[PDB]
Design a protein around this ligand. Structure first.
Ligand SMILES: COC[C@@]1(O)CC[C@@H]2/C1=C\[C@@]1(C)CCC(C(C)C)=C1[C@@H](O)[C@H](O)[C@@H]2C
Ligand SMILES: COC[C@@]1(O)CC[C@@H]2/C1=C\[C@@]1(C)CCC(C(C)C)=C1[C@@H](O)[C@H](O)[C@@H]2C
Ligand SMILES: [Mg+2]
Ligand SMILES: [Mg+2]
Ligand SMILES: [Mg+2]
Ligand SMILES: [Mg+2]
Lengths: 235, 6, 235, 6
């Protein structure tokens, strides 16, 4: 598929697609690079995450627009407009699930198993939690609890390694905690745990800022501000 | 204002 | 393709895709509606134009980013980075050309030939000029002059009908003139003609505003302001 | 400021 292009060319192209805001192309170039079978560097894992986060973020935003329409069509006094809204929300939903499944497949074949350093292992497990969480945002049936639990288990393993192996200010640790806190708040119906996790994470990071260079400080304070934005919204 | 994720 | 979906369902879905900012889906739904073979209403022709204008506007903006990179890679003192930038600009270029060709095909099979009213005929010919103009923005070879002349001929036929059959304030007439003026300025190397056309169009519209209702006035003054923005940029 | 088209 991208099988005949050199890994470095795929990487170069993914960077060009990002510059061009062509995130679907970016994701396909990164998928091809992962499929070459070599581990990803830090910068390459970032590219992979950015590409898919943008693709799925477009699909999730569209799904929410369509979901909200579909719900309004189901309220008392609404005209029957036929199956179209449901069908089209399903179409977008199916495409979004396919993207989640593609990323989860890349993580399982074979990113996670070959990731030995904390920074790589936690990064990929956070991705695993994030894409199960996007599956949970749309899940409505028999498997919903198991999808939620898959997101939980992945975030939890990433939390456990990050706590042991990374400083409290590490951006990956902070972003992981931010997302696991969102998972608690809006997926697992645990707003208390979400608040507690965002607070503890923010405070432990504040206390370690003194160890950092100016650039590291800026990196960490940026995600800390996201934790604060959520705490402000939720309290 | 939508909650933040990263 | 969209062959098994009802025309009204395609139209309903195109409107939902627009709300969801899913312009590729919107365009495919509108293509399916055109392919049902019935003429389009005013609102439906608008949907068709919006869908493709957005799709191609994304591809054109990406092509310009990639073109500018490719040109910088070809300046004195630039490191050879290999074929990737050119290949990827070509890939985006080919996709953009395919979209232009799809729209031009819909216009030729059989929108233009069945469009008898001025408002429909001028609308579709303006689209024909616009999509040949997007082809001309990327054309570099043997056919470039003929592509430019195809854009010119389509805009010219639309100008001639619009002058005879539509008031000077009609939004379609104003938008046609705006785009044909852009064609003159940046495709045909005729900035004088571009300026003259934008000025004359603006002035003739100003003089007819008095005939209009408040809503029509707002509609016409909006595109007139686009003519003015170009005149300000170019003079 | 890019020229306008519609
Ligand atoms: C899998 O989790 C990926 C991520 O959410 C964990 C935290 C953050 C991640 C993504 C991204 C590549 C995109 C947004 C940022 C920013 C905060 C600019 C970065 C990096 O620059 C950070 O160093 C860091 C890796
Ligand atoms: C083929 O040419 C299509 C077009 O450029 C000719 C002028 C304008 C067109 C497109 C679009 C559907 C999108 C932008 C506007 C706006 C100005 C809102 C409209 C309509 O609302 C106008 O009534 C009108 C048909
Ligand atoms: Mg009713
Ligand atoms: Mg390893
Ligand atoms: Mg050099
Ligand atoms: Mg007819």
């Amino acid at each position: 598929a991208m099988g005949s292009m050199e890994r470095a060319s795929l990487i170069q192209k993914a960077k060009l697609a990002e510059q061009a805001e062509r995130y679907e192309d970016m994701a396909a170039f990164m998928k091809g690079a992962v499929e070459k079978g070599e581990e990803l560097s830090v910068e390459e894992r970032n590219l992979l995450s950015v590409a898919y986060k943008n693709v799925v973020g477009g699909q999730r935003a569209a799904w929410r627009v369509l979901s909200s329409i579909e719900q309004k069509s189901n309220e008392e006094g609404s005209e029957e407009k036929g199956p179209e809204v449901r069908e089209y929300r399903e179409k977008v939903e199916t495409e979004l699930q396919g993207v989640c499944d593609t990323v989860l497949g890349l993580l399982d074949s074979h990113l996670i198993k070959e990731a030995g350093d904390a920074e790589s292992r936690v990064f990929y497990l956070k991705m695993k939690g994030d894409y199960y969480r996007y599956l949970a945002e749309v899940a409505t049936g028999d498997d919903k609890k198991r999808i939620i639990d898959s997101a939980r288990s992945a975030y939890q393993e990433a939390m456990d390694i990050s706590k042991k192996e990374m400083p409290p200010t590490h951006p990956i640790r902070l972003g992981l905690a931010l997302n696991f806190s969102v998972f608690h708040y809006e997926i697992a119906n645990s707003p208390e745990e979400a608040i507690s996790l965002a607070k503890t994470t923010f405070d432990e990071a504040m206390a370690d800022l003194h160890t950092l260079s100016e650039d590291s400080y800026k990196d960490s304070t940026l995600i800390m501000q996201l934790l604060r934005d959520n705490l402000t919204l939720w309290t | 204002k939508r909650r933040k994720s990263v």
